[model samples]
Target: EVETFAFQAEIAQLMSLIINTFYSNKEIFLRELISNSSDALDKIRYESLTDPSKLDSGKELHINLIPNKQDRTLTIVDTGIGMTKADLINNLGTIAKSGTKAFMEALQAGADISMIGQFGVGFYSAYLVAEKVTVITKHNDDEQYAWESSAGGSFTVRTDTGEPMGRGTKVILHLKEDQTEYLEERRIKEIVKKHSQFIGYPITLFVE
Candidate 1:
């Protein structure tokens, strides 16, 4: 069954702040997203240290960037710890209530998870360049689901009926017409090298 939710008041306010008030460097949206993906990778890695099964039989861990000029969309896919339906509602649905932060708190004291940042708000930066954003994710413990929003006051989540995704999350940014620079291979590479050069896992940009 599909579920529709209104953004928390704080979230709607925060989105306006990020999209309009703090409108200096729009390109950093890519950086924010890549950091979030890396954090997810870090989570699965940390969890698998104590629970081998979390790795899903040694599936590769990395981020893949696919830019489709025809579709005017850029997709960032990560083979990391995916989110459950509730996680989607809590993590992406609210501001400052990051699942990563909660996960770190739940871990044993003195253990380092190496999370990049409290990621909830960073996800909204997609609106800097995207007219709409869609997330398809699958957690090992739950079925795959899709979440979509257009930086509006409300968003929708529903069971994904498309082809099964592997154990990870895929975020698709439907780029704004004026923001098509992000669809170029050279621009994407330049942004990655400038911002996320030291990330542990390989980040590949698919070219067609």
Candidate 2:
């Protein structure tokens, strides 16, 4: 049984502004998503360092870029901490916009672990580039959850009965007609280094 969730008005407004104002600069959207991925990987690394049994947690941290010229789908995949269904509804449903002031407090507190996923709307940035976004993730001790959302109006979430990866996640973005520079390997690697090199994750670009 799944529970329904609602979005706060503030997040709806932020989404409207971003999707509208950043028409020509779609690449920034990619930067945001990748940075979020790096942060997830960092979170796992932090947890693992404290608990030795979590050693499997920080093994791989990466990003992959693939271009589908025929279908016009651009995919970027990451290995990091995956979310739960409740996380999906709350995080994706429209969150964080109303909590900016609290986020500042977290950062000033020496970014105590609280500086983490509190502002969870970063994944929505994927919609800026992909008409469709698919996520396949399994929690360390929780159920595997798969979420698919179209930029249209709603999103669907399901329990994934597939083999679990033990830890981490993968996100695929089927790009829009206009967002393609992210498809190039050179550009993808450059973006990773520029915005994500110090992000505490190993990022990779797949290409010729």
Best candidate per lDDT, number? 1
How far is each candidate from the true structure, as Cα RMSD in Å?
A: 6.7, 6.0
Off by over 4 Å in 2: 1-7, 91-120, 161-163
Predicted structure 1, TM vs. truth: 0.86
What tens-digit string does per-residue lDDT give for candidate 1 at 1-208? Answer: 8898887766665555455643546777888789889999999999998999888734799999999999999999998898898888876555464543453353334432222234345677788888899999998889999999887677889999998987999999999899999999999999999989999999999996
Could you give candidate 2's per-residue lDDT for residues 36-59 as a string of tens digits?
A: 777777777677778756646446
Candidate 1: where is the Cα deviation over 4 Å?
22-24, 91-120
Tell me the lDDT of model 2 at 42: 73
Cα deviation at 46, candidate 2, in Å, is: 1.1
Model 2: how far residue 110 lies from native, Å:
28
At residue 122, candidate 2 shows an lDDT of 59
